[PDB]
Amino acid sequence: KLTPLAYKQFIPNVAEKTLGASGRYEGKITRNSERFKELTPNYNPDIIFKDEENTGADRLMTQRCKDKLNALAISVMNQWPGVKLRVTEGWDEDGHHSEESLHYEGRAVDITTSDRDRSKYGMLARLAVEAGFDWVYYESKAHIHCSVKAE
Amino acid sequence: FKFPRSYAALLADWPVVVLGMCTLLIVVCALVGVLVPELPDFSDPLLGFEPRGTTIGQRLVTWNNMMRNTGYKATLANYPYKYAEEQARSHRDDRWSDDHHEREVDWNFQKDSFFCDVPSDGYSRVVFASAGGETLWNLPAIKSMCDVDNSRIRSHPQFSDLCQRTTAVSCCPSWTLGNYIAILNNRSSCQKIVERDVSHTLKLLRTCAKHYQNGTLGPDCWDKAARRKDQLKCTNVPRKCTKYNAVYQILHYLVDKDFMTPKTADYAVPALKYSMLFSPTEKGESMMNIYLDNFENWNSSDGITTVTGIEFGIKHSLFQDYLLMDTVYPAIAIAIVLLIMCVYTKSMFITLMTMFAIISSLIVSYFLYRVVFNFEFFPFMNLTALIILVGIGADDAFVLCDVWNYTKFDKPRAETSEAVSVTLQHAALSMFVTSFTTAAAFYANYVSNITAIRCFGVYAGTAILVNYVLMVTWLPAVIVLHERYLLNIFCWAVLCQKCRRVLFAVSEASRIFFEKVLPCIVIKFRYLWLIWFLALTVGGAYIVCVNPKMKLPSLELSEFQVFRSSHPFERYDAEFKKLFMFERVHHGEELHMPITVIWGVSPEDSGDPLNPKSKGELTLDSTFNIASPASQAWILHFCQKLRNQTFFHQTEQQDFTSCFIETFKQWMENQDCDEPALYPCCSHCSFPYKQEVFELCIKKAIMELDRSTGYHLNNKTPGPRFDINDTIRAVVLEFQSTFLFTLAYEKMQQFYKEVDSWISHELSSAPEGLSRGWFVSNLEFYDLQDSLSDGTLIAMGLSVAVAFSVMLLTTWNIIISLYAIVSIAGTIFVTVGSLVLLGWELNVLESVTISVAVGLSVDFAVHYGVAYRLAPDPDREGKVIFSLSRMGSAIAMAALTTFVAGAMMMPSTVLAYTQLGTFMMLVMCVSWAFATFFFQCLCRCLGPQGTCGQIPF
Ligand SMILES: CCCCCCCCCCC(CCCCCCCCCC)(CO[C@@H]1O[C@H](CO)[C@@H](O[C@H]2O[C@H](CO)[C@@H](O)[C@H](O)[C@H]2O)[C@H](O)[C@H]1O)CO[C@@H]1O[C@H](CO)[C@@H](O[C@H]2O[C@H](CO)[C@@H](O)[C@H](O)[C@H]2O)[C@H](O)[C@H]1O
Ligand SMILES: CCCCCCCCCCC(CCCCCCCCCC)(CO[C@@H]1O[C@H](CO)[C@@H](O[C@H]2O[C@H](CO)[C@@H](O)[C@H](O)[C@H]2O)[C@H](O)[C@H]1O)CO[C@@H]1O[C@H](CO)[C@@H](O[C@H]2O[C@H](CO)[C@@H](O)[C@H](O)[C@H]2O)[C@H](O)[C@H]1O
Ligand SMILES: CC(C)CCC[C@@H](C)[C@H]1CC[C@H]2[C@@H]3CC=C4C[C@@H](OC(=O)CCC(=O)O)CC[C@]4(C)[C@H]3CC[C@]12C
Ligand SMILES: CC(C)CCC[C@@H](C)[C@H]1CC[C@H]2[C@@H]3CC=C4C[C@@H](OC(=O)CCC(=O)O)CC[C@]4(C)[C@H]3CC[C@]12C
Ligand SMILES: CC(C)CCC[C@@H](C)[C@H]1CC[C@H]2[C@@H]3CC=C4C[C@@H](OC(=O)CCC(=O)O)CC[C@]4(C)[C@H]3CC[C@]12C
Ligand SMILES: CC(C)CCC[C@@H](C)[C@H]1CC[C@H]2[C@@H]3CC=C4C[C@@H](OC(=O)CCC(=O)O)CC[C@]4(C)[C@H]3CC[C@]12C
Ligand SMILES: CC(C)CCC[C@@H](C)[C@H]1CC[C@H]2[C@@H]3CC=C4C[C@@H](OC(=O)CCC(=O)O)CC[C@]4(C)[C@H]3CC[C@]12C
Ligand SMILES: CC(C)CCC[C@@H](C)[C@H]1CC[C@H]2[C@@H]3CC=C4C[C@@H](OC(=O)CCC(=O)O)CC[C@]4(C)[C@H]3CC[C@]12C
Ligand SMILES: CC(C)CCC[C@@H](C)[C@H]1CC[C@H]2[C@@H]3CC=C4C[C@@H](OC(=O)CCC(=O)O)CC[C@]4(C)[C@H]3CC[C@]12C
Ligand SMILES: CC(C)CCC[C@@H](C)[C@H]1CC[C@H]2[C@@H]3CC=C4C[C@@H](OC(=O)CCC(=O)O)CC[C@]4(C)[C@H]3CC[C@]12C
Ligand SMILES: CC(C)CCC[C@@H](C)[C@H]1CC[C@H]2[C@@H]3CC=C4C[C@@H](OC(=O)CCC(=O)O)CC[C@]4(C)[C@H]3CC[C@]12C
Ligand SMILES: CC(C)CCC[C@@H](C)[C@H]1CC[C@H]2[C@@H]3CC=C4C[C@@H](OC(=O)CCC(=O)O)CC[C@]4(C)[C@H]3CC[C@]12C
Ligand SMILES: CC(C)CCC[C@@H](C)[C@H]1CC[C@H]2[C@@H]3CC=C4C[C@@H](OC(=O)CCC(=O)O)CC[C@]4(C)[C@H]3CC[C@]12C
Ligand SMILES: CC(C)CCC[C@@H](C)[C@H]1CC[C@H]2[C@@H]3CC=C4C[C@@H](OC(=O)CCC(=O)O)CC[C@]4(C)[C@H]3CC[C@]12C
Ligand SMILES: CCCCCC(=O)OC[C@@H](COP(=O)(O)OCCN)OC(=O)CCCCC
Ligand SMILES: *[C@@H]1O[C@H](CO)[C@@H](O)[C@H](O)[C@H]1NC(C)=O
Ligand SMILES: *[C@@H]1O[C@H](CO)[C@@H](O)[C@H](O)[C@H]1NC(C)=O
Ligand SMILES: *[C@@H]1O[C@H](CO)[C@@H](O)[C@H](O)[C@H]1NC(C)=O
Ligand SMILES: [Ca+2]
Ligand SMILES: [Ca+2]
Ligand code: NA
Ligand code: NA
Structure with missing residues (x-):
């Protein structure tokens, strides 16, 4: 009964930094910053990480992002038996996204299915908004982008 | 000469x-005084209103230094993160290394029959009173409150950027009595409600307020009722009272505490003395232009209502200006x-x-x-x-x-x-x-x-x-x-x-x-x-x-006055914050005193006591030891003796954080071993565990919690504290007291003297690894x-x-x-x-x-x-x-x-x-x-x- 998203749709149909979406960007977090203490590494066995960095940076996220991503992991495995949630970006130290991004403060995640079956991605973005992410965007054919409010 | x-x-x-010579010395002092030091900062008025070097103050400084230094790769952590990283890398090497095979319109309540959220203390708000001393519960006064919000707040050029939204076309509606009337009777907006809607809403309030007063109403059951097409049964309350959470929200947020008294106003329409409006804009320094443009020089009235109190989060931001x-x-x-x-x-x-x-x-x-x-x-x-x-x-x-x-x-x-x-x-x-x-x-x-x-x-x-x-x-x-x-050397004519x-x-x-x-x-x-x-x-x-x-000070420190009492900001904190249910709850009517006990950190202030920004640095105790069998035995016995004291609140709901050694002993006793992967942590181990078995199995148990359960450890949570190498450098225990939180000096002195004397006496019995422990609680205002x-x-x-x-x-x-x-x-x-x-x-x-x-x-x-x-x-x-x-x-x-x-x-x-x-x-x-x-x-x-x-x- 749930409806998949369209190719460029975002569900709070307003810009990500709006108060009714993921709210204001606070500032870039780096390993020497005191706000780095507030990132948490996710170790949930229901999730696959593709950290191309090999630094583990994709596991690093804020507590609200960790809460929502674990609810999504349960939701994906419940929707399709034998399919896991996959992450290709968590917090990003590469700078590979934008001049301003919620990946730079650990409040955003770029995601796929375990199986990389692009036909499920519109339904994965639907499962994201049911799992309770504060903004969700079908950003590209390669991934869904999800983000959260600051704690 | x-x-x-x-x-x-x-x-x-x-x-x-x-x-x-005096003038030369005065200009030299003047020049050096403006050139050399950093100039005074008044952006916080309450800066330095802190005792320093007191017994309680040094333990409160130490506890805040622990909370600043607890987190991922910090001095202290709730989790053995190096063990977690190595365990994840062991699973990667076992599987992932093969298994990852390669690489504006105004809001219309007939269309949108909801508010964007519930009201809360995070939103900007104003308190209204009647200009003629009447009850506020009349149609001209209800429309006056909506008209003031539309005229003074939503009109401002910056409001469109500050407001909450679902969609780019419109801002969210304000939480106000007229908008709750406009969902309960399905009008477009507050501007189109009628005397029958006001009267019907009052009849619903009079009918349903007995369930609010008796705690049976609540905020919950509308969520499931909005899902269901037929009926609701998540409550024993009449279904009309829950229709949008409207009656709960009107009573808990929008009306003063004496509008629907349990001695009910059956004889004549109740005297609503004060009402609150919430704007869908978050409190803080972003409200400065709205206030300074539209509220500062205003005379706060339209002749139907008066704005008597304001809470925009800008009281200390205006202080340096005034x-x-x-x-x-x-x-x-x-x-x-x-x-x-x-x-x-x-x-x-x-x-x-x-x-x-x-x-x-x-x-x-x-x-x-x-x-x-x-x-x-x-x-x-x-x-x-x-x-x-x-x-x-x-x-x-x-x-x-x-x-x-x-x-x-x-x-x-x-x-x-x-x-x-x-x-x-x-x-x-x-x-x-x-x-x-x-x-x-x-x-x-x-x-x-x-x-x-x-x-x-x-x-x-x-x-x-x-x-x-x-x-x-x-x-x-x-x-x-x-x-x-x-x-x-001495108009001139007169x-x-x-x-x-x-x-x-x-x-x-x-x-x-x-x-x-x-x-x-x-x-x-x-x-x-x-x-x-x-x-x-x-x-x-x-x-x-x-x-x-x-008398000693009666408000808590964050509510300290800094302006004349007639200022709306002050009238808010000292007169209206006690009259609305959501604010009363926040000051802690039911709150017990926590008894927090810390080992492994030294209770000291190494900052400059004359600089309020210098709070020193966290000092670990090198003589601390939890993992010794004598320390494991004594710390278990301490939790069990503390729970036998008249100052301890023995609730029926167990909290598995409060004495982590008991939860760990219970977890060890569950390990029904049939494989070598559990071997040191098995349930046949007797309680004073060999030190290496304790130091290993506590990490396995803490990560098993994190994997098994949707529950998280944060800088305030009781438990062990690990360093960067996953060695336990501190322990925090916490118990609830039978004493309640109060601003009264002799009652808070009684709590402190009773608990600190018992804990200090008991700690004199401790093994050498545990003799330097200390007690802390919510005592900052009592120390002031x-x-x-x-x-x-x-x-x-x-x-x-x-x-x-x-x-x-x-x-x-x-x-x-x-x-x-x-x-x-x-x-x-x-x-x-x-x-x-x-x-x-x-x-x-x-x-x-x-x-x-x-x-x-x-x-x-x-x-x-x-x-x-x-x-x-x-x-x-x-x-x-x-x-x-x-x-x-x-x-x-x-x-x-x-x-x-x-x-x-x-x-x-x-x-x-x-x-x-x-x-x-x-x-x-x-x-x-x-x-x-x-x-x-x-x-x-x-x-x-x-x-x-x-x-x-
Ligand atoms: C070493 C000393 C350190 C002392 C500590 C730190 C001092 C900080 C000063 C801050 C301060 C007060 C000045 C007070 C002077 C007395 C000081 C006594 C000190 C004795 C030891 C600087 O005020 C500034 O003063 C400048 C002149 O001094 C003036 O310059 C101008 O004229 C030049 C000449 O013609 C010319 O060249 C230049 O171009 C001009 O711009 C500035 O415009 C003005 O803002 C800020 O307040 C300013 O003034 C008012 C204040 O209540 C306040 O009034 C408002 O409300 C009233 C009531 O509701 C109402 O009736 C007023 O209508 C209304 O406007 C203003 O809004 C506010 O802005
Ligand atoms: C730094 C520690 C922080 C701990 C934080 C705990 C967070 C909560 C999860 C604790 C937990 C799972 C964790 C298990 C791993 C723990 C490893 C810890 C290792 C380090 C210390 C413990 O589950 C464990 O289960 C064991 C097996 O059943 C049991 O052992 C026994 O077995 C053997 C004889 O049969 C023998 O061997 C052993 O002697 C025995 O006792 C233990 O006593 C018990 O603690 C589940 O407990 C449940 O938690 C619920 C709320 O999540 C809580 O809900 C209620 O309260 C809520 C408000 O609180 C409220 O909202 C809810 O509405 C309300 O319903 C339940 O009431 C509670 O029951
Ligand atoms: C921060 C420092 C540099 C302050 C230094 C202050 C002194 C230079 C002043 C303070 C008061 C002065 C005194 C005030 C009154 C008198 C009384 C006056 O008359 C007498 O002593 C009469 C008898 C006699 O001349 O012996 C002579 C100056 C004298 C001592 C003054 C000398 C200079 C003093 C000590
Ligand atoms: C203004 C501040 C920043 C600097 C102050 C330093 C000088 C300008 C002061 C220090 C000592 C003062 C002098 C002290 C003594 C005398 C002798 C005095 O001789 C007289 O016989 C009085 C003559 C008269 O004016 O009738 C004339 C002023 C003079 C040079 C003073 C002028 C001003 C001087 C040089
Ligand atoms: C003349 C006597 C009475 C005082 C002698 C010491 C002064 C040289 C100091 C005391 C307070 C200082 C003032 C304190 C605050 C300000 C506000 C500041 O403007 C602000 O808006 C920024 C303040 C901030 O840093 O947040 C400009 C300098 C000024 C007037 C400072 C200039 C130097 C002052 C006058
Ligand atoms: C009780 C102790 C701890 C007090 C110590 C401090 C002061 C209060 C003492 C120190 C010297 C005392 C004085 C020493 C001498 C005299 C003179 C004495 O006689 C006269 O005043 C009368 C003289 C006359 O014949 O005219 C009366 C007490 C008095 C003022 C004393 C009053 C109390 C004084 C000031
Ligand atoms: C309130 C303070 C901060 C003012 C200080 C200002 C200064 C710049 C000084 C430098 C020279 C002084 C002046 C030197 C000479 C005179 C002439 C004097 O003439 C009279 O008619 C004196 C009458 C009398 O007092 O008996 C009045 C004071 C005045 C202007 C003085 C006032 C203070 C002045 C202007
Ligand atoms: C609303 C406010 C702004 C009005 C302020 C008015 C004051 C500045 C006036 C009112 C009455 C005046 C006073 C009237 C009489 C005297 C006595 C006068 O005494 C002497 O000259 C010394 C006499 C002796 O030798 O003992 C000193 C000034 C004083 C206090 C005056 C100073 C100026 C005062 C206080
Ligand atoms: C509580 C504190 C702030 C009190 C401060 C002192 C005042 C009580 C003083 C300051 C100036 C004084 C005044 C200065 C001059 C006069 C004129 C004086 O006139 C006569 O006596 C007329 C005599 C004549 O010429 O015939 C009457 C008292 C009065 C008002 C004084 C009354 C006492 C005053 C008000
Ligand atoms: C507020 C506390 C610190 C006061 C504690 C001491 C007082 C009770 C003492 C100190 C000085 C005493 C006073 C000193 C002088 C006099 C004047 C005296 O006058 C006469 O005897 C008038 C007739 C005459 O001239 O003989 C009457 C008592 C009285 C008020 C005394 C009453 C008791 C006083 C007030
Ligand atoms: C000695 C003469 C010259 C002057 C009078 C000095 C003292 C008798 C008075 C003046 C102000 C008083 C203080 C004003 C306020 C307080 C707060 C008060 O706080 C409490 O805890 C009261 C009881 C409670 O609040 O439960 C304790 C006494 C104290 C320090 C008072 C003690 C007695 C003081 C120092
Ligand atoms: C009222 C109190 C609580 C305030 C403290 C100050 C008082 C001690 C002053 C204020 C007004 C004064 C009065 C104002 C005028 C007069 C007229 C005066 O008339 C005379 O015949 C004497 C005048 C002179 O000696 O020429 C007698 C004192 C009296 C009552 C004064 C007595 C002292 C008073 C009560
Ligand atoms: C303020 C309290 C708490 C402590 C002090 C208590 C007593 C030591 C005081 C209270 C009243 C005082 C008396 C008030 C009046 C007088 C009268 C005065 O009489 C004289 O004959 C003065 C000289 C003269 O006229 O010849 C001598 C001091 C004396 C006894 C004072 C001495 C000190 C006394 C007994
Ligand atoms: C002559 C000297 C010693 C006294 C100075 C003149 C008097 C006229 C002053 C001194 C103290 C003042 C009083 C200080 C405190 C108050 C309390 C104030 O508030 C209350 O009565 C209601 C609040 C409360 O009682 O809790 C009303 C003014 C009043 C009586 C003041 C009136 C004017 C007084 C009597
Ligand atoms: C009757 C004098 C009583 C003074 C009592 C007092 O508060 O003293 C404070 C001191 C300052 O002490 P600090 O420890 O901050 O001094 C540090 C100096 N490097 O400052 C002083 O002692 C200033 C004295 C000189 C004033 C012209
Ligand atoms: C008010 O709500 C009812 C459904 O309860 C709806 O039929 C009606 O059209 C609404 N009123 C208006 C004026 O649209
Ligand atoms: C405020 O100003 C308005 C417009 O002049 C007036 O109707 C109202 O009575 C005034 N109220 C007060 C308290 O000054
Ligand atoms: C403990 O951690 C620090 C870094 O915080 C490191 O320098 C030290 O080498 C570690 N201890 C051991 C025994 O390696
Ligand atoms: Ca990555
Ligand atoms: Ca990356
Ligand atoms: Na003096
Ligand atoms: Na003076």
């Missing part, structure tokens, strides 16, 4: 050298003190040069304070020293000018060196004592534990002493230059017809008062004065020592209250000791000194008893003014007391007439200038300015009357004669 023979000859022969704007009132006080002094001195030169010295004393003290004494912090209440110095700085110039005029009259043939020498012999000590008594009363506040009180004492004490040095260097040189040159005649009339009218009228009234009615000022002394002593008393009481008693006792000891050295007579302290005691009881009747409490600035009352009160009694013993008359009546005539005018002028400077602070917005102005008026009235009538009546009746009571050298 022709250097002058003496200091009196230096001032007489080379006064321009003295003014040159603090600096109100410096115009001290500037007007400077102008009036110049006017008084110019008429008194008959010289604009002596007057302007005196005021230059007063302002220079504050500049030179700022240089000494930041550059020589190296204070890194300047409290906002240091700006109040300007008002003090303007009022009291003048009070030596009047004395030195009188003594100069007496010296010129007594010895007309004298050399300028003789006139200076004789003037300084007669003036310089009396001027010092009145100054030093008041500096010492400010410096006595340096014994306070509270950083801002210590800082204000040093700054204000230093300005008073720097001003005295200028009154005996700069001012004598100015007086000599006036005599030498400007007694030649100056003799008006100005000079009026000055002569004022002179001789005043002089006849202080020579003839005032001595007559003091002496003729002396029995009336003795009875009256004794009866006032007993009345003031009863008001401060018996019933009522001065404790420090305010202690610091006031010590600073005031030190001030009274200085006041009596200088009295004896000023007048070498025990009887005069004793009548002076009896007059000063009466002055203080009447001054402080009046502040109690005005409703003052012993908060930060009020505490300081109590010791400063002592140092000020000395002034007029020492002046009349040295004039009594200077008197040539053999009889005590002649000695009193001499005292009153010779000092009456200068004392009256010193008092008047200080009263005038206080009166000018009354129009101020800032609370510290108005309170200090109230104090300056009141202490001058009481001090002047107790010196001029009561002390002089004691001298007239039984003042010493000949050598009686004289103290030998």
